[PDB]
Amino acid sequence: MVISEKVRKALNDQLNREIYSSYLYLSMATYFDAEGFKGFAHWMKKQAQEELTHAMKFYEYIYERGGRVELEAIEKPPSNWAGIKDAFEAALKHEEFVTQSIYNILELASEEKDHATVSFLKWFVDEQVEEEDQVREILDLLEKAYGQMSVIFQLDRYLGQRE
Amino acid sequence: MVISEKVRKALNDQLNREIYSSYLYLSMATYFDAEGFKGFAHWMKKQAQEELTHAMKFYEYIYERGGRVELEAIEKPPSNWAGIKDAFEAALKHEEFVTQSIYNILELASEEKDHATVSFLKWFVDEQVEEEDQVREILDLLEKAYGQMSVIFQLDRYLGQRE
Ligand SMILES: [Fe+3]
Ligand SMILES: [Fe+3]
Ligand SMILES: [Fe+3]
Ligand SMILES: [Fe+3]
């Protein structure tokens, strides 16, 4: 009933993946801020804080199931992109990879019949749907602007209001 | 007006230093949590959030002065100490290193006639004093506990109420 070390390792690896996710979004913030998109940058800082809450859910769960957390090195993220679209495409392909990693913990836990870990991951399975969708929606709004800066600047102001 | 590359680089290095600070304090939480001292772990998690607000103050000042932030790789922190007083001694030593780091930027800024940066750094010089004082107050109390798991119980409960 205590977490297996194979499940404890998959959860710890995901915890460090959420930390890197946070750092990566802060890095996109540095980029948007340097390019004068203060709203996109604000959105990325809020997203970085939200990735830290994901990491700490894994953190607390590992300890509640009798495991222990080991923090690894965080690799230097990219710091520059070839435009707004290129940055949000990278966020999406990142989140699609995080989704796939969370599915892999789900399968592992379900094969081991670790019902509590399966239940825990259900929150993240569903949340990953919304994380991909919010990025996909921004990219669609950007695409639909075509080249029109007035529309792109409104998107900057819109995303800058994020709670 | 406005920042030299030397001062910008010094601030960007301090930003990355504060990020490592927070990561180190989270790593101390992982140790305390593994040893069942949920209150010491709580205090470390609060401190880690505090270091992130330090980092973001440097973040925003760099952009306010027309510079750009570059996030660097983050070293894997230690994950194990030899008791509770040992960990808080590593924390005190680390804060002493951060204080000296901040003094070096102050001297660099003053030598470069960047009095805006000199003014900006006053908050951190003042804050680094109570950062050191708070750890030393903890270290003293951990010393008056000797082995006794009992006096540590009261301390763990007190620190666990940190707001
Ligand atoms: Fe996440
Ligand atoms: Fe995410
Ligand atoms: Fe700090
Ligand atoms: Fe500090």
Dihedral angle over CA of A47, A53, A55, A56, nearest 10: 160
Residues of B in contact with A45 (CB under 8 A): 56
Q: What ligand is nearest to the CA atom of residue B54?
A: 3
Residues paired with A74 in a beta bridge = B74
From B78's Cα to the closest Cα of chain A, the distance in A is 8
One-character DSSP codes across B70-127? ----BPPPP---SSHHHHHHHHHHHHHHHHHHHHHHHHHHHHTT-HHHHHHHHHHHHH
DSSP state for residue A2 in the 8-state scheme: P
Check if the beta carbon of residue A3 is closer than 8 Å to that of residue A121.
Answer: no
Residues of A in contact with B79 (CB under 8 A): 70-71
**Any B CB within 8 A of A57 CB:** no
**Any A CB within 8 A of B22 CB:** no
Phi, then psi, of B74 in degrees rounded to 5: -115, 125
Write down how long chain A is: 163
Peptide bond into A118 cis (omega under 30): no
Where residue B51 falls (left for φ over 0; alpha for ψ -120 to 50; beta otherwise) is: alpha
From A5's Cα to the closest Cα of chain B, the distance in A is 15
Exposure of A137 by Cβ count < 10 A (0-12 exposed, 13-18 middle, 19+ buried)? exposed
Report the residue of chain A nearest B37, measured CA to CA.
A63
Phi, then psi, of B131 in degrees rounded to 5: -65, -40
**Any A CB within 8 A of B64 CB:** no
Residues A16, B96: Cα–Cα separation, whole Å: 28
- The single-letter code of the amino acid at A157 is R
**Any A CB within 8 A of B53 CB:** no
Residues B119, A109: Cα–Cα separation, whole Å: 54
- The single-letter code of the amino acid at A8 is R
Residues A35, A20: Cα–Cα separation, whole Å: 23
Residue A18's contacts (CB-CB under 8 Å, 6 or more residues apart) are A51, A52, A54, A55, A58, A98
**Residue given tokens 């949000």 in the structure block:** A88
- The single-letter code of the amino acid at A11 is L
Residues of B in contact with A61 (CB under 8 A): none
Q: Which is nearest to A73 in space by CA: B119, B23, B139?
A: B23
Report the residue of chain A nearest B69, measured CA to CA.
A30
Measured in angstroms, the resolution is 1.9
Q: Which is nearest to B80 in space by CA: A110, A151, A70, A95?
A: A70
Residues of A in contact with B63 (CB under 8 A): 33-34
Residues A55, B100: Cα–Cα separation, whole Å: 31
Residue B42's contacts (CB-CB under 8 Å, 6 or more residues apart) are B29, B159, B160, B162
Residue B99 CA to its chain's centroid (Å) = 9
Q: Which is nearest to A16 in space by CA: B114, B26, B87?
A: B26
Distances from the Cα of A97 to the Cα of A93, A111, B3, B22, angstroms: 6, 21, 39, 26
Residues A133, A137: Cα–Cα separation, whole Å: 6
From B36's Cα to the closest Cα of chain A, the distance in A is 9
CB hemisphere CA count around A130 (13 angstroms) = 6
**Any A CB within 8 A of B70 CB:** yes
Distances from the Cα of B116 to the Cα of B9, B15, B18, B106, B109, angstroms: 16, 17, 21, 11, 9
Sign of CA dihedral A44, A50, A55, A56: positive
- Best A11, A12, A27, A30 member to test B by mutation, with max B CBs in 10 Å, is A30
Residue B146's contacts (CB-CB under 8 Å, 6 or more residues apart) are none
Report the residue of chain A nearest B75, measured CA to CA.
A73
* Cβ contacts of A155-159, under 8 Å, gap ≥ 24: A155/A39, A155/A40, A156/A37, A156/A38, A156/A39, A156/A40, A157/A39, A158/A39, A159/A39, A159/A40, A159/A42, A159/A43
Distances from the Cα of A64 to the Cα of A72, A117, B29, B111, B113, angstroms: 21, 11, 14, 52, 53
Residue B119's contacts (CB-CB under 8 Å, 6 or more residues apart) are none
Exposure of A49 by Cβ count < 10 A (0-12 exposed, 13-18 middle, 19+ buried)? middle
**Residue given tokens 């030598």 in the structure block:** B111
State in Å, rounded, how far the first CA of chain A is from the last one. 39
Phi, then psi, of A56 in degrees rounded to 5: -75, -25
**Any A CB within 8 A of B154 CB:** no
Q: What share of chain B is helix, strand, coil (3-state, %, to 5)?
A: 75, 0, 25
Distances from the Cα of A128 to the Cα of A63, A85, A103, angstroms: 23, 20, 10
Q: What are A102's two structure tokens?
A: 């969370």
From A156's Cα to the closest Cα of chain B, the distance in A is 17
This entry's atomic model was obtained through X-ray
**Any B CB within 8 A of A133 CB:** no
Report the residue of chain A nearest B34, measured CA to CA.
A68
Residue A110's contacts (CB-CB under 8 Å, 6 or more residues apart) are A118
> What's the farthest any 2 CA atoms get from each other in chain B?
57
Residue B124 CB coordination number (10 Å): 22
Report the helix count and the strand count for chain B, using DSSP H and E.
Answer: 5, 0
